[PDB]
Amino acid sequence: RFLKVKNWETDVVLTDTLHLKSTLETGCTEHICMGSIMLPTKDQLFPLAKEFLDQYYSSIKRFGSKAHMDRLEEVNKEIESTSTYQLKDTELIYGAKHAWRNASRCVGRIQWSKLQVFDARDCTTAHGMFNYICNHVKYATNKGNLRSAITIFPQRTDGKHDFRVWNSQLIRYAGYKQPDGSTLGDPANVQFTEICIQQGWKAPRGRFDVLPLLLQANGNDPELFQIPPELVLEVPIRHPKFDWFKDLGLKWYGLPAVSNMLLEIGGLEFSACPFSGWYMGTEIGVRDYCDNSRYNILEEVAKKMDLDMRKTSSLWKDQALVEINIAVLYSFQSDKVTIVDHHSATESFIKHMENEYRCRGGCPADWVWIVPPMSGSITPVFHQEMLNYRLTPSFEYQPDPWNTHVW
Amino acid sequence: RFLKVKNWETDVVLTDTLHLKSTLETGCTEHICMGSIMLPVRTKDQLFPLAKEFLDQYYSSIKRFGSKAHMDRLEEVNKEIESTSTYQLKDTELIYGAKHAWRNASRCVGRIQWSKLQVFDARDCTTAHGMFNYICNHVKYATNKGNLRSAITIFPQRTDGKHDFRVWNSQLIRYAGYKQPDGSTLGDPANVQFTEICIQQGWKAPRGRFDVLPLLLQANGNDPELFQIPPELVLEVPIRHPKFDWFKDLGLKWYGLPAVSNMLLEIGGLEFSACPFSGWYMGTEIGVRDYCDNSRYNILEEVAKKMDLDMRKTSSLWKDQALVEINIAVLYSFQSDKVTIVDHHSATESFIKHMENEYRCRGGCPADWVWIVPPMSGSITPVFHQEMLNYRLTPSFEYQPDPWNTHVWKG
Numbered sequence: 019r020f021l022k023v024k025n026w027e028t029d030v031v032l033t034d035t036l037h038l039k040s041t042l043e044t045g046c047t048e049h050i051c052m053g054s055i056m057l058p059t060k061d062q063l064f065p066l067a068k069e070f071l072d073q074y075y076s077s078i079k080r081f082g083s084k085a086h087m088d089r090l091e092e093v094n095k096e097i098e099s100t101s102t103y104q105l106k107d108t109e110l111i112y113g114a115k116h117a118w119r120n121a122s123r124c125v126g127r128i129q130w131s132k133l134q135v136f137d138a139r140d141c142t143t144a145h146g147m148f149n150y151i152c153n154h155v156k157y158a159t160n161k162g163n164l165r166s167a168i169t170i171f172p173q174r175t176d177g178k179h180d181f182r183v184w185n186s187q188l189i190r191y192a193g194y195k196q197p198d199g200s201t202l203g204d205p206a207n208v209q210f211t212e213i214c215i216q217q218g219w220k221a222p223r224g225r226f227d228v229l230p231l232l233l234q235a236n237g238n239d240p241e242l243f244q245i246p247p248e249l250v251l252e253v254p255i256r257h258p259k260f261d262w263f264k265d266l267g268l269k270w271y272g273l274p275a276v277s278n279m280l281l282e283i284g285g286l287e288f289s290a291c292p293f294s295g296w297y298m299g300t301e302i303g304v305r306d307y308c309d310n311s312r313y314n315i316l317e318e319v320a321k322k323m324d325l326d327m328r329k330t331s332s333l334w335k336d337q338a339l340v341e342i343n344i345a346v347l348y349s350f351q352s353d354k355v356t357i358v359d360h361h362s363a364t365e366s367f368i369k370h371m372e373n374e375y376r377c378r379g380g381c382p383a384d385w386v387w388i389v390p391p392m393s394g395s396i397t398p399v400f401h402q403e404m405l406n407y408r409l410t411p412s413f414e415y416q417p418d419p420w421n422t423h424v425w
Numbered sequence: 426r427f428l429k430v431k432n433w434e435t436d437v438v439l440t441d442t443l444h445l446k447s448t449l450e451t452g453c454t455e456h457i458c459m460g461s462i463m464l465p466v467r468t469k470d471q472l473f474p475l476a477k478e479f480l481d482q483y484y485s486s487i488k489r490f491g492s493k494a495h496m497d498r499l500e501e502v503n504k505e506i507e508s509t510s511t512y513q514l515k516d517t518e519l520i521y522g523a524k525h526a527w528r529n530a531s532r533c534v535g536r537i538q539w540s541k542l543q544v545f546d547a548r549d550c551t552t553a554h555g556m557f558n559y560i561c562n563h564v565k566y567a568t569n570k571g572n573l574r575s576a577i578t579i580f581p582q583r584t585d586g587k588h589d590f591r592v593w594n595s596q597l598i599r600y601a602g603y604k605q606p607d608g609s610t611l612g613d614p615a616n617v618q619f620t621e622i623c624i625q626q627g628w629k630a631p632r633g634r635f636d637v638l639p640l641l642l643q644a645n646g647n648d649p650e651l652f653q654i655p656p657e658l659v660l661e662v663p664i665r666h667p668k669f670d671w672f673k674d675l676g677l678k679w680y681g682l683p684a685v686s687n688m689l690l691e692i693g694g695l696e697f698s699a700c701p702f703s704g705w706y707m708g709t710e711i712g713v714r715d716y717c718d719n720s721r722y723n724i725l726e727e728v729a730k731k732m733d734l735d736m737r738k739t740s741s742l743w744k745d746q747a748l749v750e751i752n753i754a755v756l757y758s759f760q761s762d763k764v765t766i767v768d769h770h771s772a773t774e775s776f777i778k779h780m781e782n783e784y785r786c787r788g789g790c791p792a793d794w795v796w797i798v799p800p801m802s803g804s805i806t807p808v809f810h811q812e813m814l815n816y817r818l819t820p821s822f823e824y825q826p827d828p829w830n831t832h833v834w835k836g
């Protein structure tokens with residue numbers, strides 16, 4: 019029950035004890051592994067509060083101190099009275115950083131302690147939310163020198179007063195379904211693009227139209243806001259060898275900022291907590307550009323390369339995939355917009371695993387997500403055994419708002 | 426209890442009932458997933474239900490469940506167990522067992538082929554020389570002048586664990602590896618330990634970069650003996666690239682016949698510790714892992730140099746670019762020499778169709794995503810976007826310790 023993990027490229031073996039602190043469940047059993055499945059009250063709240071506070075006061079070397087006990091007492095009192103409780107600023111910041119630390123699917127976690135936390139808990143309106151989000155975006159973008167950030171809106175109370183950002187990312191391109199049958203723009207967003215238009219948005223019906231924010235404060239109907247264009251940094255995608263590449267018409271945004279997840283700290287639920295870092299190249303070039311149910315540009319790019327697309331065994335798809343990802347990295351780098359290639363990021367993650375095993379006793383990690391979608395085994399994480407388990411505080415998935423919202 | 430998996434590229438949803446038949450354990454708990462851990466003397470006591478479960482499966486597949494033939498067989502095995510503490514499989518049962526072991530192999534992407542398996546019954550074998558003869562015929566049959574045929578050769582089952590048959594080679598055909606005094610390795614670094622054993626056992630090593638290893642064969646618990654596969658039986662392929670003529674000069678070749686010989690076949694509780702099986706290669710097995718793993722031949726550097734790529738920063742993706750050409754060259758060379766092979770696109774597409782079929786005719790298809798997804802270009806193959814359920818069915822192929830670690834030396 020003190021588990022070992024082996025790197026089969028380097029024979030390095032790490033011992034994991036951290037997993038015994040795990041509370042939440044995996045979806046696996048001794049009879050069946052679900053490792054590749056995408057999505058598996060007052061009395062409830064105080065153990066959760068206590069556990070979080072216990073680990074917080076341990077992290078600041080004040081375990082079993084007056085200040086510890088006093089706070090445990092104080093929150094315990096407050097839970098009894100208000101049926102909920104509030105996080106001290108210090109606890110908020112700790113919780114946020116540690117949620118990221120504990121994100122078993124994030125390869126970028128070597129950066130986990132350098133997170134900028136924006137406390138938006140005083141927010142009351144969608145316009146307010148828009149202002150906080152604009153400041154987030156401007157701060158994180160930093161004229162291309164990106165900085166990790168999170169903006170935390172008021173915690174859930176009775177589920178009828180939820181703060182939600184309806185967009186899946188703060189910045190995403192619209193998706194429209196043509197009469198001719200195909201799809202213009204990003205097919206991942208067709209349903210949301212509809213709901214935007216279905217709510218008032220006037221679409222340019224272009225291929226790369228930045229979606230409007232759809233913001234929901236205190237459980238009210240969500241409101242549309244347009245992000246100032248000057249705050250949305252975009253990178254024109256060109257190849258460093260192929261001059262025809264610019265003519266493909268491709269660009270992407272610099273800021274990956276996920277906005278549909280739920281942040282859980284000490285049992286408190288933050289349904290609206292958009293957070294952002296910077297991209298790994300493959301996220302755009304492999305997934306966003308070449309996934310079949312996305313921009314799926316593979317065929318057109320290969321045709322420009324004049325490859326033998328007759329037989330699959332020419333690996334033309336593979337060739338094109340590489341070149342596309344070469345371009346993406348090259349474009350960002352050229353415009354001094356922060357980006358990391360999958361070799362650099364996976365090497366960082368191994369060093370980070372080392373650090374976490376050494377200073378924390380382990381690092382929960384989901385091999386199925388950590389290994390990049392291209393060139394898997396020539397990255398170090400492929401040969402790295404990983405233990406997946408769920409630590410708290412955490413980022414969790416939550417239902418799409420339109421399925422839930424009582425209009 | 427029913428269970429659903431979803432393809433996120435196609436939104437196809439499948440329902441698994443087959444996982445209910447699963448007996449063996451996964452390594453996982455509700456509190457931990459061991460899904461990426463590589464590897465997570467049996468008495469009459471526990472053997473009969475294992476026999477009964479197998480025979481129940483067997484007679485179901487032949488639509489004779491509860492027939493007199495079924496019951497008599499059950500009776501027959503029962504008595505034979507308590508009388509002799511083990512039992513023998515019929516030919517039909519052995520063939521069924523082998524095919525289903527492959528069908529149940531959740532880490533194998535090539536199972537669309539599972540029903541076309543040539544089973545060679547080598548249970549009458551008694552000596553290493555007899556093992557060598559059987560293995561020779563396997564290789565010739567399977568190789569078929571390049572038109573590869575799946576085959577498995579099954580040697581006598583374990584009895585008291587003190588008389589095991591084992592093939593000490595991990596594969597029937599593999600290249601030697603030699604550690605040099607300067608710390609570099611000549612040949613295949615994956616086979617250095619086993620090469621050393623062979624040398625110690627009296628093998629005279631040519632000491633080149635592609636020396637086919639001798640067979641080291643153990644019959645009936647005896648010390649293993651060395652044998653050289655006749656070269657004319659070992660089909661090899663010079664690796665060249667269709668556009669890069671300097672590629673031939675890298676000096677690479679590979680053997681055509683992937684034949685794994687270190688695994689254990691379990692059927693109805695019986696253990697077959699020597700059961701070499703072979704198919705044909707998926708290109709990436711050679712082009713990605715065998716050539717480009719840092720701990721293998723590791724040719725990325727030389728290939729990248731020869732292509733004149735910007736090798737100064739990794740963000741140039743010179744590694745990725747070289748990987749692709751190398752895998753192109755492997756496919757090109759094999760197809761040119763009419764030696765059976767399959768690229769990762771074809772094989773993954775076939776697996777999805779197989780898997781879908783298995784869900785409909787069988788109620789499930791256990792699959793290990795970590796192993797099924799190819800080691801390059803993962804997300805542009807359709808298995809990447811496919812949710813999979815991993816669980817263990819019998820008959821099965823199992824890992825077993827390396828024999829040099831467990832063997833009692835007679836002298």
Ligand code: HEM
Pocket residue numbers: 118121123124125126127129133166167168293294295296297298301358363387413
């Ligand atoms: C700073 C650079 C960062 C990099 C390079 C990075 C990289 C990645 C990548 C490649 C994924 C795979 C996601 C996918 O394929 O869709 C991922 C997932 C994830 N990241 Fe990170 N990330 C970074 C920062 C952050 C930050 C600041 C947070 C939170 C504060 C975060 C939280 C997460 C979470 C929760 C997931 C999993 C989401 C899910 O389960 O769907 N990341 N990350």
Ligand code: HEM
Pocket residue numbers: 523527530532533534535536538542575576577702703704705706707710767772796822
């Ligand atoms: C006929 C063409 C076949 C193809 C293309 C194929 C393909 C593969 C590949 C690519 C792997 C992963 C190999 C690795 O990365 O080490 C694998 C694993 C495996 N294959 Fe197949 N295979 C074939 C035939 C067979 C046959 C005939 C058997 C047995 C009768 C078999 C049983 C297995 C087993 C048990 C594994 C898992 C090995 C392990 O757990 O370490 N395969 N196969």
Ligand SMILES: CNCc1cccc(OCc2ccc3c(C)cc(N)nc3c2)c1
Pocket residue numbers: 274275276278293294295296297298301
């Ligand atoms: C579509 N894949 C499932 C899914 C659902 C919800 C959010 C998802 O986002 C993944 C994600 C989240 C955060 C990221 C951050 C902060 C940076 C980054 N480079 N990539 C990320 C990637 C993915």
Ligand SMILES: CNCc1cccc(OCc2ccc3c(C)cc(N)nc3c2)c1
Pocket residue numbers: 683684685687688702703704705706707710
């Ligand atoms: C050292 N890698 C783990 C390992 C240990 C023992 C056997 C292993 O076999 C993988 C395997 C087994 C059978 C294969 C067959 C029959 C065909 C094929 N193309 N590849 C195979 C690949 C792998």
Ligand SMILES: C[C@H](O)[C@H](O)[C@H]1CNc2nc(N)[nH]c(=O)c2N1
Pocket residue numbers: 026400401402403404460461462463795796797
């Ligand atoms: C750590 C990890 O389980 C290990 O490297 C696995 C990953 N997936 C694999 N998949 C295949 N097909 N072959 C392998 O050898 C491995 N190795």
Ligand SMILES: C[C@H](O)[C@H](O)[C@H]1CNc2nc(N)[nH]c(=O)c2N1
Pocket residue numbers: 054055056386387388433809810811812813
């Ligand atoms: C079905 C499968 O689990 C699904 O495609 C996963 C696989 N691994 C992934 N890995 C990352 N980083 N991102 C993803 O969206 C996925 N999708």
Ligand SMILES: [Zn+2]
Pocket residue numbers: 046047050051052053453457458459460
């Ligand atoms: Zn699992």
